Ligand binder design. Structure first.
Ligand SMILES: *[B@@]1([O])O[C]C2=C1[C]=[C][C]=[C]2
Ligand SMILES: [Cl-]
Ligand code: NA
Ligand code: NA
Length: 261
């Protein structure tokens, strides 16, 4: 109740629309705020694409070593790793790491293409029991985040439950689960988001997202000091098409829902 009042106050001050889902595995409890509303995932969808590749690799052992050509024609709007590999190849493992740890959009497109496209990533989500996630488009258009548009959205509740399954549950084989967690723990883009609202000693694997309408997102698995793990999704979007990012709102939400732990 106090947590709910604090999240509502944060949302009001922010000017936008805030979605939160915390799962606390210590007691199997949740804290939810707009957790059944849809939000544009933006780059947080890269977790599902990498997980789909990891699942495929369980029955294709050479898969992560498979080479993928990077061409000038593959470049999109944000290519921090891929732009260094034009005219060479990258492995699917390298593309997964680049997508998850640098939010590289060429890398995401290669993961999407490899598994068969956005509808295949979506079908993988369905196979896991997530009937909310939808990936409609490739990069860069999947980030438009237009209000009222259900494309490329999920809900905080669904993403938290699915991220729990992927990182702490049994969606993936042990090797593949460990690889996903290792990749997320090595993310370079999340220090101002959920991490900024947690004590410095806590260990975080997260994936951020940003897009149109000032959309600012983060999804995380969290190992608090001497506590059972948490899963936290913080999604945020704003009324103005050119609104600036608000990572501070995600940090504030993370602090609110973990205060007392
Ligand atoms: B994703 O939300 O993370 C960084 C980025 C994304 C999409 C488009 C451009 C950059
Ligand atoms: Cl601290
Ligand atoms: Na989801
Ligand atoms: Na973070």
């Amino acid at each position: 109740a106090d947590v709910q009042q604090k999240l509502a106050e944060l949302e009001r001050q922010s000017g936008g629309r805030l979605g939160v889902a915390l799962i606390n595995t210590a007691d199997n409890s949740q804290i939810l705020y707009r957790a059944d509303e849809r939000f544009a995932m933006c780059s947080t969808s890269k977790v599902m694409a990498a997980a789909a590749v990891l699942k495929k690799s369980e029955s294709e052992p050479n898969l992560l070593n498979q080479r993928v050509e990077i061409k000038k024609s593959d470049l999109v709007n944000y290519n921090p790793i891929a732009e260094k590999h034009v005219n060479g190849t990258m492995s699917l493992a390298e593309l997964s790491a680049a997508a998850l740890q640098y939010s590289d959009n060429v890398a995401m497109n290669k993961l999407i293409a490899h598994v068969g496209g956005p509808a295949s990533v979506t079908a993988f989500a369905r196979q896991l029991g997530d009937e909310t996630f939808r990936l409609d488009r490739t990069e860069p258009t999947l980030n438009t985040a237009i209000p009222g548009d259900p494309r490329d959205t999920t809900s905080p509740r669904a993403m938290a439950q699915t991220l729990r399954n992927l990182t702490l549950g049994k969606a993936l084989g042990d090797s593949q689960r460990a690889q996903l967690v290792t990749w997320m723990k090595g993310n370079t883009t999340g220090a101002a988001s959920i991490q900024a609202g947690l004590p410095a000693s806590w260990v975080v694997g997260d994936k951020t997202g940003s897009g149109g309408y000032g959309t600012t997102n983060d999804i995380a698995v969290i190992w608090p000091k001497d506590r059972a793990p948490l899963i936290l999704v913080t999604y945020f979007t704003q009324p103005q098409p050119k609104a600036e990012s608000r990572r501070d709102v995600l940090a504030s939400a993370a602090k609110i829902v973990t205060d007392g732990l």
